[PDB]
Structures are given as C-alpha cells and as structure tokens.
Amino acid sequence: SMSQVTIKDIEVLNCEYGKNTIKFLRLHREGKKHFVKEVEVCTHLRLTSAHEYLDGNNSFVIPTDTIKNIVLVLAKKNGISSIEQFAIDICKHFMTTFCQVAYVKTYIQEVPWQRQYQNGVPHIHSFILVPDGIRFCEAEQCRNGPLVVCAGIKDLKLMKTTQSGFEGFYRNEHTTLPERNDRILCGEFFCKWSYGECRDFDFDCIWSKVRECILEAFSGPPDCGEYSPSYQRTVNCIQMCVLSRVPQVQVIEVILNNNFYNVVDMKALGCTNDKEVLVPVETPYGSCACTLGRKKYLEAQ
Amino acid sequence: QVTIKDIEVLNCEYGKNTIKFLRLHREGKKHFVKEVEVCTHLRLTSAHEYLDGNNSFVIPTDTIKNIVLVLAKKNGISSIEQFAIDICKHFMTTFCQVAYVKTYIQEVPWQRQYQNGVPHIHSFILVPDGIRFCEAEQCRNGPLVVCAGIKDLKLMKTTQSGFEGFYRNEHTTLPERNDRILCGEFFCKWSYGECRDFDFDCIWSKVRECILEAFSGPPDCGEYSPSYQRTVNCIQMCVLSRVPQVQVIEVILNNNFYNVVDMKALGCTNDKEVLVPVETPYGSCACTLGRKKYLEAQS
Amino acid sequence: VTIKDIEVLNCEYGKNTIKFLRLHREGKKHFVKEVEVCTHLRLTSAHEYLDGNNSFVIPTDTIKNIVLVLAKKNGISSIEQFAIDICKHFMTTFCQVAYVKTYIQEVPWQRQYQNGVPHIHSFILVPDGIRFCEAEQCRNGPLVVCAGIKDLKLMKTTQSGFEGFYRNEHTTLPERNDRILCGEFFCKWSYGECRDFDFDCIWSKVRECILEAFSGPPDCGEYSPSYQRTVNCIQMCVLSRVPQVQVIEVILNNNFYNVVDMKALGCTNDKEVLVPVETPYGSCACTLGRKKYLEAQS
Amino acid sequence: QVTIKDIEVLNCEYGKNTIKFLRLHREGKKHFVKEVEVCTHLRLTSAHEYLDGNNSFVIPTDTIKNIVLVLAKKNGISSIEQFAIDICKHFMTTFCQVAYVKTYIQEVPWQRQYQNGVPHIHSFILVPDGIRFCEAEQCRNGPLVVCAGIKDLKLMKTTQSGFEGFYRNEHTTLPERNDRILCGEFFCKWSYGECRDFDFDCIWSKVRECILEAFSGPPDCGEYSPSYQRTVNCIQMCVLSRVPQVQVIEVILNNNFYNVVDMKALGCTNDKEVLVPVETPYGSCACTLGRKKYLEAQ
Ligand SMILES: O=c1[nH]c(=O)c2nn[nH]c2[nH]1
Ligand SMILES: O=c1[nH]c(=O)c2nn[nH]c2[nH]1
Ligand SMILES: O=c1[nH]c(=O)c2nn[nH]c2[nH]1
Ligand SMILES: O=c1[nH]c(=O)c2nn[nH]c2[nH]1
Ligand SMILES: [Br-]
Ligand SMILES: [Br-]
Ligand SMILES: [Cl-]
Ligand SMILES: [Cl-]
Ligand SMILES: [Cl-]
Ligand SMILES: [Cl-]
Ligand SMILES: [Cl-]
Ligand SMILES: [Cl-]
Ligand SMILES: [Cl-]
Ligand SMILES: [Cl-]
Ligand SMILES: [Cl-]
Ligand SMILES: [Cl-]
Ligand SMILES: [Cl-]
C-alpha cells in the first residue's frame, strides 16, 4: 500500500532500558569485625515518552551511566540492611527524582559469601564463596501504582535417592516411558514469591524461613522421607508448605528443572547393576512450573 | 610430498572425558552418594592407528567408559583417590599395549541435608565450597603416583593485605597500598608420590583446613599479607609443615582487585564503604614447592 | 518418727570393680580386652531396706556372674557395645529393675612391636589416658551411652598466660603471659541414643581433638589466656569435628610450676628450674550441649 | 638406766625425699623438658646430733634441696645418671662431715605430642610405660658407683607360658599347667660400677629393648617360658649378652595369675575366653646375676 511505514502506522507496545550487572561490595566495620554484602544489581526504566527511539531526540533520557551512579551513591549513603530494602530505596529514588519515569524495576542478587570459622569461632574479616542457592529480590513500581517486592532463590539443586516415582500417566503410541515407583529425584529449583506492598517484617528472617520450608517439603521427615508421585506433586508440596508456614507470602512461583539418573544396564559387561551406578541425563531435561496465589490477595485487586 | 621417515611422533594420547555417574550405597534406610566426573587417558606402545590406519591395538574410548562404570559397581568408591588408583591399575595390568595411564576425578559436592541437626537418610543439597579432585598416573615400570587437590576455591579477606616496596619503572603507575581486599580463586594440587599408608579423606580435609587457616590467619586478628605471592607461600609452608604425606604442592592464586570507587564528582566521600571488583584483566601467581628429600630420592 | 514420716528419695545397689580379660584368637594372633565393670540397679520396691524382705533382690554375686557370662557369649567388640548388652540384659531379664547403669573402663594394654613387627601374643601396659564408657536406662525410657577419657595428663611449656583477672585486697597473684600449662583432664561426652557408628573410631577421633585443641598446631602452638579458655577450645573442637557428640563435660585439674627464686643462692633462674605445686590445686569444669539436642529431650 | 657407754650406733642416715622439679631447655621455638624426683641421703662422720643434741656438723635437709636445685640450674641435666654423679661429687668435695652420699632419681615420663607424625615444639603427654630411675652412691675415699633401672614395667603374654614338674607335698594343690597368661610387673636394676665412658640414654634404651625382647620372644611365634624364674633368667642373660656396660643385674618379677573362670554352674563352657586376675595374694621372684670378672676384680 505504502513504500514505508511512518510513526502514524506503528504502535510502541513496549520501550525499556537500564543498567545490567552493577557489581559492588558494601563493607561495614564494627571495630575490627567486618561485614560484607556483595551484590549484582539490574535497574530498568520505562519513560513516559519514546522520542529517543521515534525522533532521535535524547532530551528526556537519563543515561544508564547515571543509573549506575545512583545505585552506588544509595549503597554508600543508605548501606544495605537487606537486598529487598535496597531494591525499594532504588525504586523510590527513581520515582520521586524523575518525572519522566513511568516504571522502574530493580533486580538484585547476593554473591553467596560466608564468614570463615575455626572450630566454631567466627573470623573477624575472612570469607569463603559458598553457592548453595542464589538469593535474589525484585522491586517494581508503575507511576501512581503500588511498589511491589518479590524475593526468591535460584540455582538451588536438591536430590533424594528414593521416595520418588512417576506412574499412572497418559499412554499413547509414542509413550515408551516405563512405570517407576523408585528413582532418584534430582531438581534444580527457581523459587520466587511476592510480599505485595507488605513491608512490616524482617526480610532476612522471612527469606530464611521460606528456604527452610522448601528443603523440608522437598525431603520429608529425616527418619523416613515422603513419597513423591511426580515432580509436579513435589512442586505443589513445596508451595503449600511455604503458604501454610509464611503468611507474608501472597503468591509463589516454583520451577523444577529435573535430571533423570538412569540405572546403567551392565548385562553385556557381565554385571547386574542393582541401582548401584546411575548416569545423569542433563539434556534433554524435563521442567515443570506452577504459580499459586492466596484467593484473599488476588480478590483484593 | 612429506613421508613417515621425515617426521618424528613426539606424543600420541587418547581418552574418554567427562564420564559422569553417581555410586549409590544403602545401609538399611540410610543412603550414601558419591557422584563423580572421570577422565581417563592412555598412551599406547605403538601409533599404527595414526601412521597406518590400523586399529588392532586401539582400546575403544567406549571401553574406557565401560571399565570405569564396571569398577565403580564391583569396587564401590571409598575415596576418589582409591578409585583413581583402581582405574590406573586395571589398565596397566589388563592391557600390554598401554605405555601410560592417567585418571582425573572430581567430586560433585553433594551434602546430606539436616533438619533440626538430624541427618536426612536420603536427601542431599549441592554445596560447592571448592571442588575436590584427584589424579593418578603410571608409566609401564614406573611408580603409580597419586595427587589430590581443591579448585574453584574463592577466599576473600577485607583487610590485613597490602602490596608495597615493589620494583619501580616509567610504566609503573600502581600506588603502594597497605590495606586492600585480598580476593583470590585458588587451584591447589599436591602429590603423595607412592605413599598410601593413610586415610585419603582425612588427609584431604587436613590440607583444606591448612589452606583456609594460612590464608585467613587467627580469627581474632588475622595476619598481614604483603603480597598474593607471600599468601601462596604461607599456604604451601603451612601444608608441608603439618602434612608429611604431601611431597610436592602447587598453588595458583587468581586475584580480583576491589577498587574503592572515586565518588568525588557525585558529591560523596567513599571511606572503603563501596568497592567494585575488577574481573578482567586479572593477576595470577603460581608456585610449586617440593621437599628436597623427595626430589633427590627419585633416581 | 516412722516409715510414714520418711520419704525414700533414692535406693541403689550393685557390683563394683568386676575385673576380667576377654581373650580372642585368630590362629596364632591373640587379641585382648581387659576391663573393670561396675553395674548398679534401682529396684521398683525397697522391701529389703524397709521390711527386711529380700524377695525382689538380685544378689550382687549374680550381677558379676551375668557380666562374665555375657563377655563369654557376646565377646567385646567395644566397651560401649558391652555396656549396652549388660543394660539390655537386666531390662529384659528382671522386671523388678527400674533402672540400670553400667560403667566400664579399659586396662590400657598395647601390643608389643619389635623393629616394626607386631607381636602375636605379647603386650605392655601403656596408660596415656584411661578409656571409659557408661550406659544407663530407666524402665521404658531411652538407653543413653557416654564415653570418656580420664587420668589424661597434658603439659605445654609456653603459649599460656593468665591476665586481666578480678583484683581485690586478698589478690596477690601477678599477671603472667608466659607459664607452664599442666592439666589432668576428665572428659565425658554423650552420644544420646545414637548408636549407628564405630564406637572405637569415634572415641579415637575425640581423643585426637582433645590433644590437638590443647596443644594447638605443632609448628607454633596457640596462646591460652586461661585454663577455662583451653577447656572451651577442647569442647568446641570436639563439637565442631564429631557430630555424634551431643554433650561434652571437661574438668581440668591444674598444677602450677613455680620458677624457683634462687637469688639467695647466688643464681639467676631464667625459667630454667620450675617446681610443681600439686596441693592446693585449681580446677575448672564446663558442660556444653547442642541446643537442638537439649530441646529434643524436653 | 642405759647410757651411751652400753649402746653401739650401728647406722645413722638422713636426707631430703621427693625433690620434684622440671628442667626446661629451649633451642629456638623447640622446648625440651626433663622432670625428675630426687632423693639425696647422707651419713655423717659423727652422730653428735643424735648422741649429744649438738647440731654443729648437721647440713640441713633444706640445704640438700637447695644444692639439688642449684646444680640442675648450673649444669642442666643431660642424663639423670650424670646429674646423680654431679650431686654425689658435690657433697663429697664440699663437706668434710659426709661419710657417704646416695642420690636416687626417677624421671617423670613426659613424651612429646605428635600431630599426624609431626613432633610438637612444646606440648607433652604423661606416658608411664615403665619408670626410668638411677642411683649413684659413694663412701668417702671409696668408688663412686652408678646404677640404672626401670620399674613399674607391666608386661603380659597370653600363651607360651607354663609351670610343671614342681615339688609336690601334702599341702600342694596347684595343677600342672603348660598354657597360661604370663603377667609380670618388673623392677630391673643394673650396675655400671665405675665405668662412665658411654652414652647413658643410649645404653638405658638398649637394656629396655633387651628386657621386652627376652620377655616376649620373637614376634612371629614367641618363646616358651617354663616358669616366672626362667623368664627372669632369660631377661638377665639377654641384657648381659647384648650390653657389655652392665656388670650386675637385679630383676624382680611380681606376677598376677589369670584364672580361667569355671562357668559350668552358669550353663557355659569357658575355653580360655574369660580370665580373672588375682592381684592379692601374689607371687614374686627375684634374682641378681653378676659377671665373674667384675666380682673377682673387687
Ligand atoms: O514426575 C514426572 N513428571 C513428568 O511430567 C514426567 N515426564 N517424564 N517423566 C516424568 N516424571
Ligand atoms: O600482591 C600483589 N602482587 C603482584 O604481583 C601485583 N601486581 N599488581 N598488584 C600486585 N599485588
Ligand atoms: O588460668 C587460670 N585460671 C584461674 O582461674 C586461675 N586462678 N589462678 N590462676 C589461674 N589461672
Ligand atoms: O612360674 C611359676 N613359679 C612359681 O614359683 C610358682 N608358684 N606357683 N605358681 C608358680 N609359677
Ligand atoms: Br613395645
Ligand atoms: Br600424642
Ligand atoms: Cl570455613
Ligand atoms: Cl545410561
Ligand atoms: Cl608405531
Ligand atoms: Cl540442609
Ligand atoms: Cl584499596
Ligand atoms: Cl622435608
Ligand atoms: Cl591389636
Ligand atoms: Cl610463670
Ligand atoms: Cl659420734
Ligand atoms: Cl591357665
Ligand atoms: Cl641374647
């Protein structure tokens, strides 16, 4: 119909920009005892207009360099009591300082530094990297909308060697999977939960409590464990534990990426392999994901 | 144009890489796991597969994988070191066309889960706090040598570290510093030579404790490091002083500088409060120390 | 005054210092375990005290016979397993037993060696700290096992002080940052009901923790600012490195070594000649337990 | 009634007992300890302190202690034998009134601690596996004689022992036995006479090796003992064959019989499995052997 499209022909469905992987360590000294919080911050903005795209005019653009500067200044002046409070302080600063900001999102993850110990005695200033699951949070706010905070844990890899099966599934001409009532259940978990606009609690304490719920629901009691009839059922058991034990959690998303461990057939090698040697299949891999919300929280919107 | 008689075969080696498996063991309802990654390489007495297209002497890399899995099944894995020994011994004593065998093993760092200080019978969590590995090798008619190690071990102290009194030249702009963050990623490897009259797990743990303690110093005051290099030496001398089984120790320290961000132009003072890691480029230092007694004793 | 005015707070009886050697032979090679056993009972009634009625009393002679028969029939893999077997035997054999406690200590026989070769059947007494254990059970309550080391005498010649202590008008002790630290230790630890480990292995591991924490590393040692702090270092080492230990009790009986004033004798004594003071002597004692374990009891 | 005229002084002797001290020596960071118990006794050339109440010639026992401590400080202690020699020589050269001096010394058995085969610079553990002692004595204008020994040495073998073919009378109920536990606590003491041209520590260790090897026999099979008395002879003949410095050797063996408990009345057979030691009463035997040449040469 026409030889080109012009602004009049097209709708801007989304415009977003920001600064990614702002890495720094906040050091706090109480005499000779040293405290560290090392983080990675992503902060993204949507502006009220798109002249920098549509017209080649930068008048309203806050440089991403400025976004980095603000994150480092706020760390210096405010410290970091929790990554959640820091994500909140960043979002509130952008919304209050810059009228051209329609929307702000701050994602933060912690570098998993632990204090070193010598026969139970905490070291004043020495640390070791211990990645047993990465702590993150995310704060976002629309102009004239609520400031919403999420916390989570990712790269969390749990494995139980029994009390796991997958049976009674749908069968068809392309379904060769045998029924199994014993197998290794190996999952890499991404867990993310919403507090909504709630802030009246200790962020670090509540995060720890959720992490506990995830490990406990996954494992079952330490003397006997608990049967899992699917990866999916195990995801629901985790979500329902967190919701049952942590009232501040309004919505919870859990993604389980599984690895199957095959009992190697050793008959041609002159052996019987009685669930002794198991080879992980890393690709392809199965995943399942569910998001559960409290009826009260969702209806209250 | 060029023929077999103009060229010398300096080296021929082949193997199977990244053989991954979990060895499961049950004592009633209590389950135990060892998950490993194994490389095994061979040198053969002839090179006909390369020079002539004749495979008669070649043990398939598929067979190397089958043997590793069969040995894990029949022998179990008490320690990765004993399993590395078992694999090298099997190749040496089974195949007369093997001139040399090398097995590398690394553990997947599964930890048993705890609820209220009670250990879980069959539930585990992945906790990398430094990757345990080992390596066994042997030439025909030569010692079976065992090495153990820890890698991807990232240690950081926020004080008791400087670098001063260095060599000055026209291209040297580095300031002298007596307070900086010391952050290093360590690769540590040590040889037991032929000795195996000790508990591999116990001695591996002891060397690890030596590394952490020599790095950190005492927990109430720490200990001043005047260079990355001096910290490497304190680790090595601590291990050799406390672990006679260690004959030779190699330590590599890959460091990250943490820069106190100049916040002047932002109207801020930064008194060592906000520090930015420089990941690339990065400094390295490496040292191998050996006991004179062990070195001289090799005829 | 009458039985009606009087409460029986406690009644207990038993057989003490039951001494025997259990000999085991694998062809030419002999193995020994020589022990001393005490076994005490509390009965469900006190008719022997209150009425002169012995109908419920198991003779202490029978307690000895039972200890000797079980050693014969069961052998002794570990003193802890033997103590368990004796408590279990009393609880299943005699319903009038309300409570049983068995204490066992090992006679410290070591196999003799000649130029590195172990002797098939010859031993030497080597007391380097006496191994003991204790098992006890109430009727329908848990069987609890403790192991320990006593008469363990350790000494370091430096890396010991006592400074910054409370001063008053009767305090003449000077501040010291260098002294001999000499202690006789009693150490006892509870496994609770946990029994799924090698008793000998774990005992050896706790012993090594005690010596290493007392001494510090062999190339430099470790400063002790008090006997009390050294007790704490030993306990925290054991608890940090041995998960099976739930509760640990350490008693340190110290001996002061005085640098003799030889000025009157025309001599300077630069910490060269030291005289030990055996009485009076100082003691300190601490019991630490895992919070998780102590909560799980209540 | 009776006066000095009617009575003869057969013997007078006095001294200081249990003088305890530690001698500490430092080579850089490395500490060396020798802790000893010293007894020093004198006979004087007169007895006026007893007979007349005149103390003019008495050296206070407090002075004997001061001299032992002063000599430890000034000389150090290379060996307890050299220290005992130095004490006797001091009393003889210093005091006109000394007719006779005897010095007895025993070592406190401190052993350096080891961690994973590494010797600790300054930490020790008490390990009493046979107490080292010595004794020096001298009459005025007579030879200074030195003895060394080992006591409280407890050895046990579980077979290769019997006692048969002994004298029988109407009061003899002991059965012939060809297979018993041989358990002895040994006191061994030997004389070097006046010879001192050797390493005292070296030679003491050699004698101790000889006692353990002769008691035990070879590690692969042992050696049959037909009595305690013949084991004492084997020990002595082994020392005299292998250690030419030893002129005279005394060995005292205090034995403990281990009874195979008769368990027929308890429904059991006891096939040398459970044995009970008899600590009292107890048998002893003692022999002193000397080289003909040294006994003639007196
Ligand atoms: O638990 C399981 N869920 C699934 O959806 C599935 N698909 N293959 N195996 C499976 N196991
Ligand atoms: O400790 C240090 N060693 C070095 O070699 C170096 N080079 N730059 N900074 C350094 N710091
Ligand atoms: O370490 C010590 N603790 C004490 O309680 C004490 N009392 N005197 N000396 C002492 N030394
Ligand atoms: O060896 C022995 N000697 C004795 O003199 C003796 N007397 N009873 N048993 C004995 N055994
Ligand atoms: Br021996
Ligand atoms: Br030791
Ligand atoms: Cl640590
Ligand atoms: Cl497979
Ligand atoms: Cl070839
Ligand atoms: Cl856990
Ligand atoms: Cl700096
Ligand atoms: Cl060396
Ligand atoms: Cl043995
Ligand atoms: Cl002092
Ligand atoms: Cl007289
Ligand atoms: Cl007999
Ligand atoms: Cl001989």
Helix (H, G, I), strand (E, B) or coil at A54: helix
Atom of ligand 3 nearest to the CA of C160: 1
Phi then psi dihedrals of residue D103, to 5 deg = -115, 120
**What does this entry list as its resolution, in Å?**
1.9
Q: What DSSP state is assigned to residue B265?
A: G
Would the CB of B233 count as within 6 Å of ligand 2? no
* CB contact B243 to D (< 8 Å): yes
| Residues in chain B after which the backbone breaks (C–N beyond 2.5 Å) | none
Of the candidates C218, C219, C292, the beta carbon closest to that of B117 is on C292
Q: How far apart are CA D269 and CA D262, in angstroms?
A: 8
User: B80-94 vs B200-216: helix axis angle to the nearest 10?
Assistant: 130
CA distances from D19 to A43, D107, D246 (A): 80, 12, 28
Closest Cα to residue A193, out of A238, A141, A259?
A: A238
The alpha carbon dihedral of B236, B242, B248, B254 has a sign of negative
* CB contact D115 to B (< 8 Å): yes
Closest Cα to residue B238, out of A106, A269, D116, A204?
A: D116
Q: How far apart are CA A47 and CA A61, in angstroms?
A: 8
Q: How far apart are CA A81 and CA A70, in angstroms?
A: 17
Both structure tokens of A219: 């494992």
Q: Nearest 5 degrees, angle CA B221-CA B223-CA B224?
A: 125
B187 strand-pairing partners: B252
- DSSP characters for chain C? --GGG-------EEEEEEEEEEEEEETTEEEEEEEEEEEEEEES--HHHHTS--TTPPPHHHHHHHHHHHHHHH--S-HHHHHHHHHHHHHHH-TTEEEEEEEEEE--EEEEEETTEEEEEEEEE--SSEEEEEEEEETTS-EEEEEEEEEEEEEESSSB-B-S----TT--PPPBSS--EEEEEEEEEE-TT---S-HHHHHHHHHHHHHHHHH--TTT---BS-HHHHHHHHHHHHHHH-TT--EEEEEEEEEEEEE---GGGT---SS-EEEEE-SS--EEEEEEE-HHHHHHH-
- Residue ranges of the annotated binding site of A for O2 are 64, 258
Helix (H, G, I), strand (E, B) or coil at B48: helix
CA distance, residue C208 to nearest chain A CA (Å): 14
Closest Cα to residue C120, out of C27, C20, C22?
A: C27
Of the candidates C21, C122, C260, the beta carbon closest to that of D275 is on C21
- Token look-up 């530690």 returns D22
List of chain D residues whose C-beta atoms are within 8 Å of the C-beta of residue C281: none
Both structure tokens of A134: 């990465």
Q: Whose CA is nearest to atom 2 of ligand 2?
A: B227
Ligand at minimal distance from the CA of C179 is 14
Test B117 with C293 for CB contact under 8 angstroms: yes
B5-44 core/surface letters (b: 16 or more CB in 10 A; e: else): eeeeeeeeeebbeebebbbbeeeeeebebbbbbbbbbbbb
Residue A104 contacts residue A116 (beta carbons within 8 Å)? no
Span from the CA of C274 to the centroid of ligand 14 (angstroms): 9
| Residues in chain A after which the backbone breaks (C–N beyond 2.5 Å) | none
B121-143 core/surface letters (b: 16 or more CB in 10 A; e: else): bbbbbbebbbbbbbbbbbeeeee
Span from the CA of B132 to the centroid of ligand 8 (angstroms): 24
| Residue D26 marked as a ligand binder | no
| Residues with Cβ within 8 Å of residue D128, at least 6 apart in sequence | C127, D109, D152
Residue A153 contacts residue A191 (beta carbons within 8 Å)? yes
List of chain D residues whose C-beta atoms are within 8 Å of the C-beta of residue C123: 155-158
Ligand 3 pocket mutation, candidates C224, C229, C254, criterion most atoms within 8 A of CB: C254
- Token look-up 């195949």 returns B95
Span from the CA of C114 to the centroid of ligand 5 (angstroms): 7
Question: Three-state SS across chain D?
Answer: CCCHHHCCCCCCCEEEEEEEEEEEEEECCEEEEEEEEEEEEEEECCCHHHHCCCCCCCCCHHHHHHHHHHHHHHHCCCCHHHHHHHHHHHHHHHCCCEEEEEEEEEECCEEEEEECCEEEEEEEEECCCCEEEEEEEEECCCCCEEEEEEEEEEEEECCCECECCCCCCCCCCCCCECCCCEEEEEEEEEECCCCCCCCHHHHHHHHHHHHHHHHHCCCCCCCCECCHHHHHHHHHHHHHHHCCCCCEEEEEEEECEEEECCCHHHCCCCCCCEEEEECCCCCEEEEEEECHHHHHCC
Residue A114 contacts residue A130 (beta carbons within 8 Å)? yes
Task: Report the C-alpha dihedral over residues A205, A208, A209, A211, rounded to 10 degrees.
Answer: 160
| Residue D133 marked as a ligand binder | no
Helix (H, G, I), strand (E, B) or coil at B77: coil
Would the CB of B46 count as within 6 Å of ligand 2? no
Q: How far apart are CA C59 and CA B48, in angstroms?
A: 86
Q: How far apart are CA C284 and CA C247, in angstroms?
A: 17
Atom of ligand 1 nearest to the CA of A228: 1
Span from the CA of D162 to the centroid of ligand 16 (angstroms): 8
D252 strand-pairing partners: D187, D286
Closest Cα to residue C129, out of C219, C250, C24, C279?
A: C250
Helix (H, G, I), strand (E, B) or coil at A199: coil
The set of long-range contacts for A272-277, using a CB threshold of 8 Å and a minimum separation of 24, is A273/B73, A275/A182, A275/B24, A276/B23, A276/B24, A276/B25, A276/B72, A276/B73, A277/B21, A277/B22, A277/B23, A277/B24, A277/B69, A277/B72, A277/B73
- DSSP characters for B221-255? T---BS-HHHHHHHHHHHHHHH-TT--EEEEEEEE
C194-225 core/surface letters (b: 16 or more CB in 10 A; e: else): eeeeebeebbebbbbbbbbbbbbbbeebbebe
Cβ-based neighbour number of residue D197 at 10 Å: 6
Both structure tokens of A152: 């989570």
Closest Cα to residue C204, out of B30, B244, B242, B202?
A: B202
* CB contact C22 to A (< 8 Å): no
| Residues with Cβ within 8 Å of residue A26, at least 6 apart in sequence | A36, A37, A38, A39, A75, A79, A80, B273, B274
List of chain C residues whose C-beta atoms are within 8 Å of the C-beta of residue A119: 213, 233, 236-237, 240-241
Would the CB of B283 count as within 6 Å of ligand 2? yes
User: Which chains form contacts with chain B, at 3 or more CB pairs under 8 Å?
Assistant: A, C, D
Both structure tokens of A301: 């919107």
End-to-end CA distance of chain C: 38
Q: How far apart are CA C65 and CA C233, in angstroms?
A: 43
Q: Nearest 5 degrees, angle CA D269-CA D270-CA D272?
A: 145
Q: How far apart are CA B146 and CA B136, in angstroms?
A: 4
Residue D180 contacts residue D161 (beta carbons within 8 Å)? yes
Q: How far apart are CA D122 and CA B284, in angstroms?
A: 38
* CB contact A223 to C (< 8 Å): no
Question: Domains plus CATH for chain A?
Answer: 9-145 (3.10.270.10), 156-301 (3.10.270.10)
Span from the CA of D59 to the centroid of ligand 10 (angstroms): 75
Closest Cα to residue D41, out of D7, D64, D70?
A: D64
Q: How far apart are CA C221 and CA C156, in angstroms?
A: 9
In one-letter notation, the amino acid at residue A123 is H
Q: Whose CA is nearest to atom 2 of ligand 4?
A: D227
- Residue ranges of the annotated binding site of C are 60-61, 162, 179, 228, 254
Q: Residue B86 is inside which H or E element, if any?
A: helix B80-94
Both structure tokens of A274: 């009685």
Give the mutation candidate from D113, D116, D120, D121 for the B interface (greatest B CB count, under 10 A): D116
Q: What DSSP state is assigned to residue A201?
A: S
Ligand 3 pocket mutation, candidates C159, C160, C165, C229, criterion most atoms within 8 A of CB: C165
Give the method used. X-ray
Atom of ligand 1 nearest to the CA of A260: 9
User: C227-241 vs C199-215: helix axis angle to the nearest 10?
Assistant: 140
Phi-psi region of C27 (alpha: psi -120 to 50; beta: other; left: phi over 0): left
In one-letter notation, the amino acid at residue D269 is T
Cβ-based neighbour number of residue A298 at 10 Å: 10
Q: What DSSP state is assigned to residue A179?
A: P
- DSSP characters for C114-155? ETTEEEEEEEEE--SSEEEEEEEEETTS-EEEEEEEEEEEEE
Q: How far apart are CA A63 and CA A69, in angstroms?
A: 10
Residue C218 contacts residue C262 (beta carbons within 8 Å)? no
Would the CB of C165 count as within 6 Å of ligand 3? no
* CB contact C236 to A (< 8 Å): yes
B254 strand-pairing partners: B185, B284
CA distance, residue B32 to nearest chain D CA (Å): 28
Span from the CA of C275 to the centroid of ligand 14 (angstroms): 10
Give the mutation candidate from D16, D24, D211 for the C interface (greatest C CB count, under 10 A): D24
Give the mutation candidate from B31, B32, B116, B207 for the C interface (greatest C CB count, under 10 A): B116
Residue A126 contacts residue B222 (beta carbons within 8 Å)? yes
Phi-psi region of B218 (alpha: psi -120 to 50; beta: other; left: phi over 0): beta
Residue B203 contacts residue B245 (beta carbons within 8 Å)? yes
Give the mutation candidate from D22, D31, D268 for the C interface (greatest C CB count, under 10 A): D22
Closest Cα to residue A297, out of A198, A214, A192?
A: A198
Q: Do you know the residue count of chain A?
A: 301
- Token look-up 């204490």 returns C103
CA-nearest residue to A121 within chain C is C236
Q: How far apart are CA C97 and CA C58, in angstroms?
A: 9
Both structure tokens of B265: 């132009």
Residue D99 contacts residue D43 (beta carbons within 8 Å)? yes
